[PDB]
Amino acid sequence: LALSLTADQMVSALLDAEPPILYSEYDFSEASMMGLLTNLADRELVHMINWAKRVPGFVDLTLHDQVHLLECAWLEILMIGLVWRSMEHPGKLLFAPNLLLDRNQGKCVEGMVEIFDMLLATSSRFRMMNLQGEEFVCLKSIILLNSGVYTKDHIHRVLDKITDTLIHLMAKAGLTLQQQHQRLAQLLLILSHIRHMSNKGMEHLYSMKCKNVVPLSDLLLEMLDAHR
Amino acid sequence: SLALSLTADQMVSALLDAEPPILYSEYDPTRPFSEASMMGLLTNLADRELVHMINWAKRVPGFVDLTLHDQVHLLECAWLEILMIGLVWRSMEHPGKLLFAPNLLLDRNQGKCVEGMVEIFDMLLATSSRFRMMNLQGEEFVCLKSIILLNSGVYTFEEKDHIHRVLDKITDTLIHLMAKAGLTLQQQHQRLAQLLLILSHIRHMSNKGMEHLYSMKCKNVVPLSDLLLEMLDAHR
Amino acid sequence: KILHRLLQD
Amino acid sequence: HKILHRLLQD
Ligand SMILES: O/N=C/c1c(O)ccc(-c2ccc(O)c(F)c2)c1Cl
Ligand SMILES: O/N=C/c1c(O)ccc(-c2ccc(O)c(F)c2)c1Cl
């Protein structure tokens, strides 16, 4: 089915598949904030699973491959989402509508300010590029299918389709050929930074875990243990 | 800047000529491997490569235009990625093996000699396998290595605009190479994307190798050189 | 694993 | 300064 969709239908499908924006249980210590972030992430994870199943090509994969891809990519996916909805709040991270944190509230947790700064710099970059919603959804699907793919032709064929869709959107927006290729590259290089940020976030989350205090859901612990 | 003025062909020429040499390890075949001694080999090798990497980065168009602090930051951020993409590249024609050096060609089973290392060998091998399947070309490899140098640290920053201009030039160069090679227009954007997506995997391996290296330091497995200690501390 | 169950359901 | 900082000059 995925290989048969048009560019516009790929976009329509991904837009349709988008997960809800969730609220946190907010109403400020190292523990309370982390509880908030991990509580939010756990609930987001459940909606991410439904969304993945709606990314074209993904339900074609074995359950085992679906699990591996999600285990590798879940924090990357949460983070690009966070960056996307923070785009229009310079110097702030919109974890949720009722949880808009600035770089300084990141200092409320050891090691967290550095991660916030990377998240904020990426938001700034999206803003600089005037990243579009259609492009964002494409990039998010690329993360899902790409991050764990080396650890299969079908995945790579689907990936190429999404590249075609990105280029379609850019051509439709009036960009020259040269501009399309440059922008595609700019967009994909951000995925390097998003990988970096997930790696750092994973190590952090892991430290929080061993230190007890902040309780993580069974699901979060399991996703976490797949990276160790 | 003169970098922005270079043609696609001159860009490729500059990068191919700037390529560092393949170095030998201090491997001693009179002695069996231990965890310590194998880690010693890789770190001694990385240290000697770093010096050549610095000369190389100075010849990447646009890099000399940055302040010393910017050059330091980019290299601190990308050094292990740059070492690893080179490793994967030279391992290409050795399926199932990692050519750290001509005198140090290791399979995954030798990686097991160091705790937590086999996981990393497997990722490196899978990436080499991927280069092989894509039939990555030397001209593409040099472009990708230069992209890593300029990109990895770029969002940890005016001249940031300059760097992005240079990065755009390298994109034009990649496209130029693929077209020259006869790839259709669709194939060009599809390959560009396949090539850049690999940089996400390279970043992953670098982060995992950085944590592994830090582990060996803190367990006193091997003494890292002062330069290595400095590059590492930039990540902690 | 919990992820298994969520994918099926 | 860093060792890296000095190598960049030499
Ligand atoms: O250790 N904390 C992990 C962490 C972090 O460092 C930064 C952000 C988040 C986070 C990112 C995106 C989210 O949607 C989220 F709900 C939490 C987490 Cl869980
Ligand atoms: O402790 N881990 C560090 C590490 C690794 O896990 C894998 C490869 C290397 C390495 C990679 C590329 C090189 O050119 C090299 F000399 C070492 C290191 Cl230093």
Short mmCIF file of all heavy atoms in Angstrom, two decimals, chain B residues 39 41-49 79-88 90 98-101 114-117 120-121 124 205 208-216 228, ligand 2:
data_model
loop_
_atom_site.label_atom_id
_atom_site.label_comp_id
_atom_site.label_asym_id
_atom_site.label_seq_id
_atom_site.Cartn_x
_atom_site.Cartn_y
_atom_site.Cartn_z
N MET B 39 42.44 -2.46 23.97
CA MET B 39 42.04 -1.07 24.17
C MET B 39 43.24 -0.14 24.01
O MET B 39 43.09 0.97 23.49
CB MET B 39 41.39 -0.88 25.54
CG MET B 39 39.93 -1.29 25.56
SD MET B 39 38.95 -0.36 24.36
CE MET B 39 39.33 1.33 24.83
N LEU B 41 45.72 -0.58 21.95
CA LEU B 41 45.96 -0.42 20.51
C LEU B 41 45.03 0.61 19.89
O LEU B 41 45.48 1.52 19.19
CB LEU B 41 45.81 -1.76 19.78
CG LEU B 41 46.82 -2.86 20.11
CD1 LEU B 41 46.55 -4.08 19.26
CD2 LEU B 41 48.24 -2.35 19.89
N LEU B 42 43.73 0.47 20.15
CA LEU B 42 42.75 1.37 19.54
C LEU B 42 42.97 2.81 19.97
O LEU B 42 42.81 3.72 19.18
CB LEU B 42 41.32 0.96 19.88
CG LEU B 42 40.88 -0.48 19.65
CD1 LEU B 42 39.34 -0.55 19.62
CD2 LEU B 42 41.47 -1.02 18.38
N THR B 43 43.34 3.02 21.24
CA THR B 43 43.46 4.38 21.75
C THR B 43 44.76 5.04 21.30
O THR B 43 44.79 6.24 21.05
CB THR B 43 43.31 4.45 23.27
OG1 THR B 43 44.16 3.47 23.87
CG2 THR B 43 41.87 4.18 23.66
N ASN B 44 45.83 4.25 21.25
CA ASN B 44 47.10 4.73 20.72
C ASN B 44 46.94 5.11 19.25
O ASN B 44 47.43 6.16 18.82
CB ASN B 44 48.15 3.63 20.85
CG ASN B 44 49.50 4.04 20.30
OD1 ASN B 44 49.78 3.87 19.11
ND2 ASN B 44 50.35 4.59 21.17
N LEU B 45 46.27 4.24 18.50
CA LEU B 45 45.95 4.50 17.08
C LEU B 45 45.08 5.74 16.93
O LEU B 45 45.35 6.58 16.07
CB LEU B 45 45.27 3.29 16.42
CG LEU B 45 44.89 3.46 14.94
CD1 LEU B 45 46.12 3.69 14.06
CD2 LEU B 45 44.08 2.28 14.39
N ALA B 46 44.03 5.86 17.74
CA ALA B 46 43.15 7.02 17.62
C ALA B 46 43.94 8.30 17.87
O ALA B 46 43.75 9.32 17.20
CB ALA B 46 41.92 6.92 18.58
N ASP B 47 44.85 8.24 18.84
CA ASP B 47 45.60 9.41 19.24
C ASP B 47 46.47 9.90 18.09
O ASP B 47 46.52 11.10 17.81
CB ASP B 47 46.46 9.10 20.46
CG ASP B 47 47.38 10.24 20.83
OD1 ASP B 47 46.87 11.26 21.36
OD2 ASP B 47 48.59 10.13 20.59
N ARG B 48 47.17 8.98 17.44
CA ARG B 48 48.03 9.35 16.32
C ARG B 48 47.19 9.85 15.14
O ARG B 48 47.60 10.76 14.43
CB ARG B 48 48.96 8.21 15.94
CG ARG B 48 50.30 8.26 16.73
CD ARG B 48 51.23 7.09 16.43
NE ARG B 48 50.57 5.81 16.67
CZ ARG B 48 50.28 4.92 15.73
NH1 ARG B 48 50.63 5.15 14.46
NH2 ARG B 48 49.67 3.79 16.05
N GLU B 49 46.01 9.26 14.94
CA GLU B 49 45.14 9.71 13.85
C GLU B 49 44.63 11.13 14.09
O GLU B 49 44.44 11.91 13.15
CB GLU B 49 43.95 8.78 13.67
CG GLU B 49 44.27 7.37 13.21
CD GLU B 49 43.01 6.54 12.95
OE1 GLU B 49 42.43 5.99 13.92
OE2 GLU B 49 42.57 6.45 11.77
N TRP B 79 35.14 14.43 16.44
CA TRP B 79 36.34 13.62 16.23
C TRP B 79 36.09 12.11 16.13
O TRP B 79 36.67 11.45 15.27
CB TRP B 79 37.42 13.91 17.28
CG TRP B 79 37.09 13.40 18.65
CD1 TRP B 79 36.38 14.06 19.61
CD2 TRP B 79 37.46 12.13 19.22
NE1 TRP B 79 36.30 13.28 20.75
CE2 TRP B 79 36.95 12.10 20.53
CE3 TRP B 79 38.18 11.03 18.75
CZ2 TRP B 79 37.13 11.00 21.39
CZ3 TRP B 79 38.37 9.93 19.60
CH2 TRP B 79 37.84 9.93 20.91
N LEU B 80 35.29 11.54 17.02
CA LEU B 80 35.11 10.07 16.97
C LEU B 80 34.23 9.66 15.78
O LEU B 80 34.45 8.62 15.16
CB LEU B 80 34.58 9.51 18.31
CG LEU B 80 34.61 7.98 18.47
CD1 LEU B 80 36.06 7.42 18.26
CD2 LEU B 80 34.14 7.60 19.89
N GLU B 81 33.23 10.47 15.45
CA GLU B 81 32.48 10.20 14.24
C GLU B 81 33.40 10.14 13.02
O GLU B 81 33.29 9.25 12.18
CB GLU B 81 31.44 11.29 14.02
CG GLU B 81 30.27 11.28 14.99
CD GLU B 81 29.24 12.32 14.59
OE1 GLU B 81 28.54 12.06 13.60
OE2 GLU B 81 29.16 13.40 15.22
N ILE B 82 34.29 11.12 12.92
CA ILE B 82 35.22 11.22 11.81
C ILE B 82 36.18 10.02 11.78
O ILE B 82 36.48 9.48 10.72
CB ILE B 82 36.00 12.55 11.90
CG1 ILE B 82 35.03 13.72 11.70
CG2 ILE B 82 37.14 12.59 10.91
CD1 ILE B 82 35.62 15.09 12.04
N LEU B 83 36.66 9.60 12.95
CA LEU B 83 37.50 8.41 13.02
C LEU B 83 36.72 7.18 12.59
O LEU B 83 37.23 6.34 11.85
CB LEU B 83 38.03 8.20 14.45
CG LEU B 83 39.14 9.14 14.88
CD1 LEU B 83 39.65 8.73 16.24
CD2 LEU B 83 40.27 9.14 13.86
N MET B 84 35.47 7.08 13.04
CA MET B 84 34.66 5.90 12.71
C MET B 84 34.20 5.83 11.26
O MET B 84 34.19 4.75 10.68
CB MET B 84 33.44 5.83 13.65
CG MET B 84 33.82 5.36 15.06
SD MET B 84 32.31 5.38 16.07
CE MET B 84 32.95 4.57 17.55
N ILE B 85 33.79 6.94 10.67
CA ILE B 85 33.44 6.86 9.25
C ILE B 85 34.65 6.44 8.42
O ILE B 85 34.51 5.68 7.46
CB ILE B 85 32.77 8.15 8.69
CG1 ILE B 85 32.09 7.85 7.35
CG2 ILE B 85 33.76 9.29 8.52
CD1 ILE B 85 31.33 9.05 6.76
N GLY B 86 35.83 6.89 8.80
CA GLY B 86 37.05 6.46 8.12
C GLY B 86 37.30 4.97 8.25
O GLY B 86 37.67 4.30 7.28
N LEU B 87 37.11 4.45 9.46
CA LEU B 87 37.24 3.01 9.73
C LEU B 87 36.28 2.19 8.88
O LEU B 87 36.66 1.20 8.24
CB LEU B 87 36.98 2.74 11.22
CG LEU B 87 36.92 1.27 11.61
CD1 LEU B 87 38.26 0.59 11.33
CD2 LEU B 87 36.54 1.13 13.09
N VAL B 88 35.02 2.61 8.88
CA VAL B 88 34.01 1.91 8.11
C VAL B 88 34.42 1.95 6.64
O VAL B 88 34.36 0.93 5.94
CB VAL B 88 32.61 2.53 8.36
CG1 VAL B 88 31.59 1.98 7.41
CG2 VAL B 88 32.19 2.27 9.80
N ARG B 90 37.43 2.21 5.22
CA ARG B 90 38.54 1.35 4.83
C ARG B 90 38.26 -0.14 5.10
O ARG B 90 38.94 -1.01 4.57
CB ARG B 90 39.88 1.82 5.43
CG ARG B 90 39.88 2.05 6.93
CD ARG B 90 41.28 2.47 7.44
NE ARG B 90 41.30 2.50 8.90
CZ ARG B 90 40.98 3.57 9.63
NH1 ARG B 90 40.64 4.70 9.03
NH2 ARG B 90 40.99 3.50 10.95
N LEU B 98 36.97 -5.37 10.55
CA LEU B 98 37.21 -3.94 10.71
C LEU B 98 38.71 -3.68 10.53
O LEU B 98 39.52 -4.18 11.32
CB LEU B 98 36.76 -3.49 12.09
CG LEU B 98 35.24 -3.54 12.28
CD1 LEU B 98 34.92 -3.08 13.70
CD2 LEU B 98 34.59 -2.63 11.28
N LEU B 99 39.07 -2.92 9.50
CA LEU B 99 40.49 -2.63 9.20
C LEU B 99 40.90 -1.39 9.99
O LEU B 99 40.97 -0.28 9.42
CB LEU B 99 40.71 -2.40 7.70
CG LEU B 99 42.18 -2.47 7.26
CD1 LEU B 99 42.59 -3.92 7.22
CD2 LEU B 99 42.42 -1.81 5.91
N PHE B 100 41.14 -1.55 11.29
CA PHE B 100 41.61 -0.43 12.09
C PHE B 100 42.91 0.10 11.50
O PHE B 100 43.13 1.32 11.45
CB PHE B 100 41.82 -0.86 13.55
CG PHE B 100 40.52 -0.94 14.33
CD1 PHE B 100 39.83 -2.15 14.45
CD2 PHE B 100 39.96 0.20 14.91
CE1 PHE B 100 38.61 -2.22 15.16
CE2 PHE B 100 38.76 0.13 15.61
CZ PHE B 100 38.08 -1.07 15.74
N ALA B 101 43.74 -0.84 11.05
CA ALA B 101 45.03 -0.56 10.42
C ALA B 101 45.36 -1.76 9.56
O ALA B 101 44.80 -2.84 9.75
CB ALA B 101 46.10 -0.37 11.48
N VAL B 114 37.20 -7.15 24.74
CA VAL B 114 36.99 -5.95 25.54
C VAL B 114 35.52 -5.86 25.92
O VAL B 114 34.65 -5.92 25.05
CB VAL B 114 37.36 -4.68 24.75
CG1 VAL B 114 36.98 -3.43 25.53
CG2 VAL B 114 38.87 -4.67 24.42
N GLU B 115 35.24 -5.73 27.21
CA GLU B 115 33.86 -5.73 27.67
C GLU B 115 33.10 -4.58 27.01
O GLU B 115 33.60 -3.46 26.95
CB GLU B 115 33.80 -5.59 29.18
CG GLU B 115 32.40 -5.69 29.76
CD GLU B 115 32.42 -5.76 31.27
OE1 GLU B 115 33.48 -6.13 31.83
OE2 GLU B 115 31.38 -5.45 31.89
N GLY B 116 31.90 -4.88 26.51
CA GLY B 116 31.05 -3.89 25.90
C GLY B 116 31.47 -3.43 24.52
O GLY B 116 30.84 -2.56 23.93
N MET B 117 32.55 -4.01 23.99
CA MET B 117 33.06 -3.56 22.70
C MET B 117 32.39 -4.22 21.50
O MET B 117 32.23 -3.60 20.45
CB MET B 117 34.57 -3.78 22.61
CG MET B 117 35.11 -3.49 21.23
SD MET B 117 35.06 -1.74 20.85
CE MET B 117 36.64 -1.23 21.56
N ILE B 120 29.66 -2.51 19.73
CA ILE B 120 30.14 -1.42 18.90
C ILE B 120 30.73 -1.97 17.60
O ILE B 120 30.39 -1.47 16.52
CB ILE B 120 31.12 -0.51 19.69
CG1 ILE B 120 30.43 0.01 20.96
CG2 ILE B 120 31.64 0.64 18.82
CD1 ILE B 120 31.26 0.95 21.82
N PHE B 121 31.58 -3.00 17.68
CA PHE B 121 32.04 -3.65 16.44
C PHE B 121 30.86 -4.02 15.53
O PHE B 121 30.92 -3.79 14.32
CB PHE B 121 32.88 -4.90 16.72
CG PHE B 121 34.33 -4.62 17.04
CD1 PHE B 121 34.71 -3.40 17.59
CD2 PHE B 121 35.31 -5.56 16.76
CE1 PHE B 121 36.05 -3.13 17.87
CE2 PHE B 121 36.65 -5.31 17.04
CZ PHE B 121 37.02 -4.08 17.60
N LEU B 124 29.57 -0.98 13.67
CA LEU B 124 30.56 -0.56 12.68
C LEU B 124 30.51 -1.49 11.47
O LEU B 124 30.48 -1.02 10.32
CB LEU B 124 31.98 -0.55 13.31
CG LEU B 124 32.17 0.60 14.30
CD1 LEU B 124 33.34 0.38 15.29
CD2 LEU B 124 32.35 1.91 13.54
N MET B 205 26.83 5.59 16.81
CA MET B 205 28.03 4.82 17.15
C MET B 205 29.03 5.68 17.89
O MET B 205 29.67 5.24 18.85
CB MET B 205 28.67 4.23 15.90
CG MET B 205 27.79 3.19 15.22
SD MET B 205 28.54 2.42 13.77
CE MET B 205 28.84 3.86 12.73
N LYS B 208 27.96 6.02 21.45
CA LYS B 208 28.16 4.77 22.18
C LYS B 208 29.66 4.51 22.42
O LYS B 208 30.06 3.99 23.47
CB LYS B 208 27.49 3.61 21.44
CG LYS B 208 25.95 3.62 21.53
CD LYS B 208 25.49 3.34 22.96
CE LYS B 208 23.96 3.35 23.11
NZ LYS B 208 23.37 1.98 23.20
N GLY B 209 30.49 4.88 21.45
CA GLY B 209 31.93 4.68 21.61
C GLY B 209 32.50 5.65 22.63
O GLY B 209 33.51 5.36 23.31
N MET B 210 31.88 6.82 22.74
CA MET B 210 32.33 7.81 23.71
C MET B 210 32.07 7.33 25.13
O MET B 210 32.92 7.45 26.03
CB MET B 210 31.61 9.14 23.47
CG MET B 210 32.36 10.35 24.02
SD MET B 210 33.87 10.65 23.07
CE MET B 210 33.16 11.33 21.56
N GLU B 211 30.88 6.78 25.33
CA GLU B 211 30.52 6.23 26.63
C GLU B 211 31.37 5.02 26.98
O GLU B 211 31.72 4.81 28.16
CB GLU B 211 29.04 5.85 26.64
CG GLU B 211 28.11 7.06 26.72
CD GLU B 211 28.38 7.92 27.95
OE1 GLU B 211 28.32 7.38 29.08
OE2 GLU B 211 28.65 9.13 27.78
N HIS B 212 31.71 4.21 25.98
CA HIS B 212 32.55 3.05 26.21
C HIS B 212 33.94 3.51 26.58
O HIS B 212 34.55 2.99 27.51
CB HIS B 212 32.65 2.15 24.97
CG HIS B 212 33.43 0.91 25.21
ND1 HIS B 212 34.77 0.79 24.90
CD2 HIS B 212 33.07 -0.27 25.78
CE1 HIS B 212 35.19 -0.41 25.25
NE2 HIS B 212 34.18 -1.08 25.79
N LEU B 213 34.44 4.50 25.86
CA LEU B 213 35.78 5.02 26.13
C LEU B 213 35.84 5.58 27.55
O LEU B 213 36.79 5.35 28.30
CB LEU B 213 36.13 6.10 25.09
CG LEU B 213 37.59 6.51 24.96
CD1 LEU B 213 38.47 5.27 25.00
CD2 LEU B 213 37.79 7.26 23.65
N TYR B 214 34.81 6.33 27.93
CA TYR B 214 34.77 6.93 29.25
C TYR B 214 34.74 5.82 30.29
O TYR B 214 35.35 5.94 31.35
CB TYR B 214 33.52 7.80 29.37
CG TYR B 214 33.45 8.65 30.61
CD1 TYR B 214 34.22 9.80 30.74
CD2 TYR B 214 32.57 8.33 31.63
CE1 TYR B 214 34.14 10.59 31.88
CE2 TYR B 214 32.48 9.10 32.77
CZ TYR B 214 33.26 10.23 32.89
OH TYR B 214 33.16 11.00 34.03
N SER B 215 34.04 4.73 29.99
CA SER B 215 34.02 3.61 30.91
C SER B 215 35.42 3.03 31.12
O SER B 215 35.80 2.70 32.24
CB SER B 215 33.09 2.51 30.42
OG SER B 215 33.13 1.41 31.32
N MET B 216 36.19 2.90 30.05
CA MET B 216 37.51 2.31 30.17
C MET B 216 38.44 3.22 30.97
O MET B 216 39.27 2.76 31.74
CB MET B 216 38.08 2.04 28.78
CG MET B 216 37.18 1.18 27.91
SD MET B 216 37.47 -0.57 28.25
CE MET B 216 36.19 -0.93 29.45
N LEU B 228 43.60 12.83 24.13
CA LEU B 228 42.39 12.01 24.19
C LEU B 228 41.52 12.37 25.40
O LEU B 228 40.30 12.56 25.27
CB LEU B 228 42.75 10.52 24.22
CG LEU B 228 42.04 9.65 23.21
CD1 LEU B 228 41.48 10.54 22.10
CD2 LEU B 228 43.00 8.62 22.65
O1 LIG E 2 36.36 2.33 23.73
N1 LIG E 2 35.78 2.46 22.54
C1 LIG E 2 36.38 3.27 21.68
C2 LIG E 2 36.51 2.96 20.20
C3 LIG E 2 35.56 2.07 19.74
O2 LIG E 2 34.64 1.54 20.63
C4 LIG E 2 35.55 1.70 18.41
C5 LIG E 2 36.50 2.24 17.53
C6 LIG E 2 37.47 3.12 17.96
C7 LIG E 2 38.31 3.58 16.93
C8 LIG E 2 37.65 3.97 15.76
C9 LIG E 2 38.34 4.45 14.66
C10 LIG E 2 39.71 4.56 14.70
O3 LIG E 2 40.38 5.05 13.61
C11 LIG E 2 40.37 4.19 15.85
F1 LIG E 2 41.71 4.27 15.90
C12 LIG E 2 39.69 3.69 16.95
C13 LIG E 2 37.47 3.52 19.31
CL1 LIG E 2 38.71 4.64 19.80
#
